[PDB]
Every structure is written in C-alpha cells, then in structure tokens.
Amino acid sequence: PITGLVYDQRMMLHHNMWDSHHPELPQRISRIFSRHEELRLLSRCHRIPARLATEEELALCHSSKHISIIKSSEHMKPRDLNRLGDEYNSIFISNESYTCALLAAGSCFNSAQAILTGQVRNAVAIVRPPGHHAEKDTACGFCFFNTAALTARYAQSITRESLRVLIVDWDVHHGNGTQHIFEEDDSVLYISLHRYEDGAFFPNSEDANYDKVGLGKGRGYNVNIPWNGGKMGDPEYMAAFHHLVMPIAREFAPELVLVSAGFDAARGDPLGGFQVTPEGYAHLTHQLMSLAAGRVLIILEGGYNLTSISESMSMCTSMLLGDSPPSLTPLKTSATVSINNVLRAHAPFWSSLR
Ligand SMILES: CN1CCc2c(c3ccccc3n2Cc2ccc(C(=O)NO)cc2)C1
Ligand SMILES: [K+]
Ligand SMILES: [K+]
Ligand SMILES: [K+]
Ligand code: NA
Numbered sequence: 001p002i003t004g005l006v007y008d009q010r011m012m013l014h015h016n017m018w019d020s021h022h023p024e025l026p027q028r029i030s031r032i033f034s035r036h037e038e039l040r041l042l043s044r045c046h047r048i049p050a051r052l053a054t055e056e057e058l059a060l061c062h063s064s065k066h067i068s069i070i071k072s073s074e075h076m077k078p079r080d081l082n083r084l085g086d087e088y089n090s091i092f093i094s095n096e097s098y099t100c101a102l103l104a105a106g107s108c109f110n111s112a113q114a115i116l117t118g119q120v121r122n123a124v125a126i127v128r129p130p131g132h133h134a135e136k137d138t139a140c141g142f143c144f145f146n147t148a149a150l151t152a153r154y155a156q157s158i159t160r161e162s163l164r165v166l167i168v169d170w171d172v173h174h175g176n177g178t179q180h181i182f183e184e185d186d187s188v189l190y191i192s193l194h195r196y197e198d199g200a201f202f203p204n205s206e207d208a209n210y211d212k213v214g215l216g217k218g219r220g221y222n223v224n225i226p227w228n229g230g231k232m233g234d235p236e237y238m239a240a241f242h243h244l245v246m247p248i249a250r251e252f253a254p255e256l257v258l259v260s261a262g263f264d265a266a267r268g269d270p271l272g273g274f275q276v277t278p279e280g281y282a283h284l285t286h287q288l289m290s291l292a293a294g295r296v297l298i299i300l301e302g303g304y305n306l307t308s309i310s311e312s313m314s315m316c317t318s319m320l321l322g323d324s325p326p327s328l329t330p331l332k333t334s335a336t337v338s339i340n341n342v343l344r345a346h347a348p349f350w351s352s353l354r
C-alpha cells in the first residue's frame with residue numbers, strides 16, 4: 001500500500017542551447033516536483049532512486065546504430081549538435097542529452113522493478129526527455145529512446161516474455177514509436193488517445209488512425225482513439241475511457257499498467273489545444289488503478305504549460321496514494337463519431353465492445 005516516486009534534478013541538464021524558451025524546458029520536471037512538495041505528496045511516497053539505463057537495456061527496443069549515434073553527441077561541439085538534431089523530426093541535442101535520456105529510462109526500470117518485486121504498489125516517474133515518439137532506429141519529437149516501451153520490455157525481462165503489459169498513452173500526440181515497437185505483439189496492448197485532425201496534427205501520419213488495429217499476432221492489440229474537429233476535454237476523455245479504454249483493458253487483464261502520461265491535452269497547453277482538467281486526469285488515473293491489482297506506473301511524456309502539468313500530474317499522484325477522487329457535458333459530435341469508429345474497428349477482437 002505504498003506509492004513510489006522517482007525524480008532526479010540531473011534530468012534538467014538536457015537543454016536547447018539555441019532557444020532557451022523552447023517549450024520542452026528543464027523546469028518542467030522541477031516545477032512538477034515542487035508542486036508535489038507543496039501539496040505534501042512527496043513525503044507520502046517512497047523515493048525510488050534514478051539510475052542510468054545500460055546500453056544492453058536500450059537494445060531491448062533500439063538498434064545499436066541509433067544508440068551509438070545518440071551516445072556520440074556527448075562530446076560534440078555546438079555546430080555538430082545542431083547538424084545531428086536536424087537529422088530528425090523536432091529534436092534538439094546538448095552534451096547532456098544522452099545521460100538524461102538514460103536516466104529517464106533507468107528511473108522507470110527501477111520503478112517497474114519496485115512494483116514487480118512488491119516494494120511499492122504503484123509509482124510515478126517525473127522524467128525528461130520524453131519517450132513515446134522514439135522509434136527503434138530514430139529519435140523524434142523531443143524523444144531519444146522510448147522510455148515506456150523499454151520499461152515494458154524490461155518488465156518482461158525480469159518476469160516472462162509474455163507478461164501482459166497495458167500502455168495507456170494519454171499525451172495529446174500519438175505515440176508513433178510505441179505503436180511501431182509493439183505492432184506485432186499481443187503481450188503489450190497499446191491504447192492511445194490523441195488529437196489527429198485527419199493527419200494535420202503532429203506527427204502527421206495516418207498511422208495514428210483508428211483503423212490501425214495491429215498486425216499479425218498483434219492484431220487487435222493496438223487501439224488508436226483519434227480526435228478530429230478541435231478542442232476536446234473531460235467529457236470526451238471520460239467517454240473514451242467508459243466505452244473503449246476500460247472495457248478493452250479489463251478483457252486484456254494486464255499484469256502491469258504503464259501510463260505514457262503527457263499533460264499536453266491539459267487546459268492551458270499552448271500546443272495541444274485541449275481542455276482536460278486536473279480533476280479529469282485524477283479520474284482517468286483512478287479508473288486505471290482498478291486494473292492489474294493496482295500495479296500502475298505513471299511516466300511523464302509531454303505537457304508544456306508549467307502550471308497545468310504540475311497540478312495535473314500531482315492530482316494523479318494523489319490518486320495513486322489512495323485519496324478520494326475530486327468532484328467532476330454532452331460530447332462534441334465529432335468525438336461521438338471517433339468513439340464509434342474505434343468501437344467498430346475493435347469489436348471483432350474484443351467481446352466487451354459488442
Ligand atoms: C508544428 N507544430 C506541431 C509540431 C511542433 C510545433 C512546435 C512549436 C514549438 C516547438 C516545437 C514544436 N513542434 C514539435 C513538437 C514535437 C513533439 C511534441 C511533443 O512531444 N509533445 O508532447 C510537441 C511539439 C508546432
Ligand atoms: K497519446
Ligand atoms: K500491440
Ligand atoms: K478495421
Ligand atoms: Na537494478
């Protein structure tokens with residue numbers, strides 16, 4: 001009946017030397033950590049130490065070439081960091097980036113280990129840079145290595161290959177890297193909710209549409225819930241959880257739940273354009289706690305309004321600690337259309353949807 005928390009100020013060292021106001025700020029993690037202190041949540045958690053991921057652990061999901069290229073940035077001059085970062089879609093690199101990415105992943109491995117060895121019931125990881133856009137062979141969208149995907153494979157490496165891991169990705173963006181890593185895998189159920197706008201929203205691929213249901217033995221094990229038609233908020237997220245996320249998750253019966261917990265769908269986020277409230281995130285967390293005997297690890301992804309992310313992630317930790325959920329309209333038409341499209345796509349695979 002204990003909640004773990006991992007945070008290490010060393011992850012602040014990754015920075016954008018050309019644009020100090022770039023939204024993926026060092027202060028994202030320190031602001032969230034400070035809010036946990038202010039709300040007296042930190043003293044209620046068991047502190048789990050950060051560690052570096054090893055290169056062998058990175059190789060659970062990533063190619064040796066990709067690992068070595070990112071590692072090579074540790075001693076690069078500015079011009080070379082710029083050139084390397086520009087090889088990718090939406091990446092900046094500093095000499096500290098590789099270490100920080102290692103720390104984000106190893107923090108999550110230690111948290112998964114703490115849950116699976118029974119030291120804690122659940123945990124929260126206040127980490128950066130984020131992970132879910134990183135692919136086997138490339139960095140993308142602020143992400144170097146796919147922390148959540150690696151954590152699922154790490155968990156399987158200390159239990160069994162077929163350990164059932166649910167990844168719920170509520171960052172406003174599609175976790176293209178996570179989808180691809182697990183596309184043929186029935187051991188890892190990936191469920192993403194994301195703004196899509198028929199491909200107009202980053203990362204601008206039809207891979208994020210509802211008809212991408214998985215491949216081969218993984219068919220049915222990839223659930224994309226794509227939003228179209230502008231601002232969505234608590235009503236739409238609650239409805240998606242009620243009709244899709246929770247029924248599928250219960251049927252899958254995960255043994256571990258990882259949350260790719262971006263807070264860029266939050267009210268106030270300049271990039272997401274959505275209105276999910278801190279109370280909304282608390283309710284989503286509380287629902288997920290009903291799965292996997294409560295074995296839930298919340299991993300920070302995106303989220304760029306410092307006040308919004310600090311309040312939102314803190315509310316999630318309050319839920320993990322067992323606090324009562326806070327008090328919480330009809331859906332937008334396009335949201336009903338999205339949910340129905342996903343229901344039709346997934347009813348062949350999940351009896352709970354029929
Ligand atoms: C072109 N628009 C979409 C893409 C984009 C925009 C943007 C603005 C500032 C910095 C990065 C930006 N990016 C790249 C970008 C990449 C990843 C993420 C992300 O990881 N969000 O959680 C957020 C933004 C605006
Ligand atoms: K998502
Ligand atoms: K999958
Ligand atoms: K289909
Ligand atoms: Na260890």
Ligand SMILES: [Zn+2]
Nearest residue numbers: 171173264302
């Ligand atoms: Zn995002």
